[PDB]
């Protein structure tokens, strides 16, 4: 695209408050920046806030999120549609003019670990372009297994194609696929989707604590085989429900948006590879990694 | 095929009847039909009864079927395997030659919405031309939630790939990716497989309603990722079992032939897609809308 | 590789014996052997023990797991990662030079039906090349529905590509998806991963049986619709954990690792075939067969 010739639209942080007991303040944008995705290959990705995925949105059960989009880019028109929320999509997820913003209300009322991405036709095109991310919404009470959680991570795949190239998004097999992690805590890493950052600058833990980590495979186009090497999990909530209760799963099939919360036992010092099982994916920059201290 | 040049045999109705409290009769044919599966785009599908997905078949939990299938194909043997039913295949699933019939009886004691298909080897070919199809076994004590809905449809996911070209078949991209509906009241629409229909005549519903869908992706070959914009899934039976429960899906991963009953609330007047989240297949045409009004 | 050329090395049997109340040790190696995936067609696989996929393994809930190596690649090493067990990878799922042996203990304390592998990276290439196999864990209270099963049997699927081809492995559709059967009790077959072998010699069953079926999608790739033509399955336990139950599934999605344990009755003879419902790959290859007889 002529207009997007030159541009790398420098990150803006994720604005966010809280306004009342049940209504939270989200201001994101939609523009256009230059990320590494894999060593030496740069993307000028289709973004929110210049992070592909986005930033992390958490929210309560009973939220109600009053979002305003401000389109940074000078030519696309772009649009939010978050999988938490109830919403008309043809009033609610609608476009914003480039150079203009929007602001539109709706409720989560369900617990889990749900996608959001750009709803503008082509969706494909969009996504595949960059504009995906997780927003999750904490269970009102709980689950069942909190108690025991000592160390939590939220972790994201999706994939990279040609280049804004809409003949392989469609009939193409990707390029790359690739974790990231989004914080929740200060210190926690906050990266983008890339080949490498996860496995140079592994997450952190220690011996023998159980992880939680909330998942959400955003595709746009594979399903993901979840697995944890050298662990198994404990207690699995699919799309983060606490009622989706598996237990003892070696791997956890994600379709595409799919979430779900994962809780493992690292039991013994080392690195601890994470990956897609489909290991075309895995080989294509899917693996991230754990590194498991004494301390 | 030369025996099918310029063949294009008009759709004949499902038959059906009831012949005791625990059994039905049911007749279909095998035949071919032109069917138009993207605008301008004619695919001269082997089908049930001139339909692509087949029509609609219904029983109860407990029905034995007594299943009479007419091949009007002029060279080529088809076949009927219900994937509701227990049987031999090798005794009760066979060929029926060129206009010739042949009856099966067998016991549906499973409820759920299952999968049926010609099962004439090779079967990739028969399915990938376009006979496949659904039939819904209502279990004998409902589901928990049936006093809650207000609304059901029935939807079902199929792929197109080049004319009868079994090379396409076993090893290239669909070529389109299509939902269809099929009626389960008078006045429900009844549809092919197609890239439009459902976009340019919406599912109809009313604001605040909750509606149940009847679903299964019939394949022939990939994973469905089902989704329904603006919404989240209230419940969720997998393979329309009962015990099967999920709460607060987002997306509902559908093997191969796999099935589900999925509830959600519409809450606001608007046009919601539904969606393979798989989203080049989206784009190749798995968008279906539902329209929400005020009345 | 040339230091391959020309090497067929013997199958040996996995070895294993128990050593205390909750101790087993095993013994395996890592070799080159030829075996023919398809009439006609030769792969110079990767193995452990000369079987692709492997030797089964099986342990009680609770046990550790004393096991043992011996790398007989004249020149790769490999490695062995087993999904049933709480382990270090970056210590104990580590090479083993050609012609060393290593040895290596972990604990097996979650029941079900794992994947194991060579995990040496580039971790694609060996298991494409034929390193997978089977871990089954019997739970320490059995599975609720024990008391109805006649039978069981054990089978696994998995892909095969161009020889050795790093490029296909990464982007190329599986050039053939195969079942094979790992024996349980003596007297059932045991099979490599082949187009033929479970059609040419099914495996057999008597009439009204109630049949299990351990069963592990290996990959490494795709993902698998598990079905069996004319039967549902009566109970499905998610990777073969006896908490996570389903009823009354006509087919089972596996993740690219993933397993289950399967349950469904036979009521008619005749012959039931066994596939991936993803059609494509049971054109090419992925099809058993179950012959179910009056004896
Ligand atoms: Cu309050
Ligand atoms: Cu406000
Ligand atoms: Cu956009
Ligand atoms: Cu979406
Ligand atoms: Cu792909
Ligand atoms: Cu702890
Ligand atoms: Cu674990
Ligand atoms: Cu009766
Ligand atoms: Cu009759
Ligand atoms: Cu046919
Ligand atoms: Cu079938
Ligand atoms: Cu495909
Ligand atoms: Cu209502
Ligand atoms: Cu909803
Ligand atoms: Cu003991
Ligand atoms: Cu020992
Ligand atoms: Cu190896
Ligand atoms: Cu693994
Ligand atoms: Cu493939
Ligand atoms: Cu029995
Ligand atoms: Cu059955």
Chains 1, 2, 3 share one sequence.
Not at 78 to 96: E, G, L, Q, R, Y
Request: with cysteine; hydrophobic share 35%; proline share 8%.
């Amino acid at each position: 695209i002529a207009a997007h010739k030159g541009v790398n639209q420098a990150p803006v942080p994720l604005k966010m408050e809280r306004v009342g007991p049940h209504d939270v303040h989200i201001e994101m944008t939609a523009q256009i920046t230059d990320i590494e995705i894999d060593k030496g290959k740069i993307y000028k990705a289709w973004t929110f806030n210049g992070q592909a995925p986005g930033p992390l949105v958490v929210v309560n059960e009973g939220d109600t999120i009053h979002f305003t989009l401000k389109n940074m880019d000078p030519v696309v028109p772009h649009s939010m549609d978050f999988h938490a929320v109830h919403a008309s999509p043809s009033k609610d997820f609608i476009d914003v003019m480039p150079n203009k913003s929007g602001t539109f209300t709706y409720p989560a009322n369900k617990p889990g670990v749900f996608m959001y991405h750009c709803g503008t036709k082509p969706v494909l095109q969009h996504i595949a372009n960059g504009m995906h991310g997780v927003i999750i919404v904490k269970p009102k009470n709980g689950y069942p297994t909190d108690k025991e959680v000592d160390r939590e991570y939220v972790l994201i795949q999706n994939e990279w194609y040609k280049y804004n190239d809409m003949n392989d998004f469609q009939n193409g097999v990707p390029s790359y696929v690739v974790f990231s992690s989004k914080a929740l805590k200060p210190g926690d890493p906050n990266t983008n989707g890339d080949t490498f950052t996860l496995k140079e600058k592994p997450l952190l833990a220690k011996v023998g604590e159980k992880i939680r980590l909330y998942i959400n495979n955003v595709g746009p186009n594979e399903v993901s085989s979840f697995h944890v090497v050298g662990t198994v999990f404990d207690d699995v909530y699919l799309d983060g429900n606490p009622n989706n209760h598996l237990q003892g799963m070696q791997t956890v099939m994600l379709p595409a948006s799919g979430g779900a919360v994962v809780e493992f036992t690292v039991t013994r010092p080392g690195t601890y590879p994470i990956v897609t099982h489909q290991f075309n994916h895995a080989q294509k920059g899917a693996v991230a990694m754990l590194k498991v201290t004494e301390t």
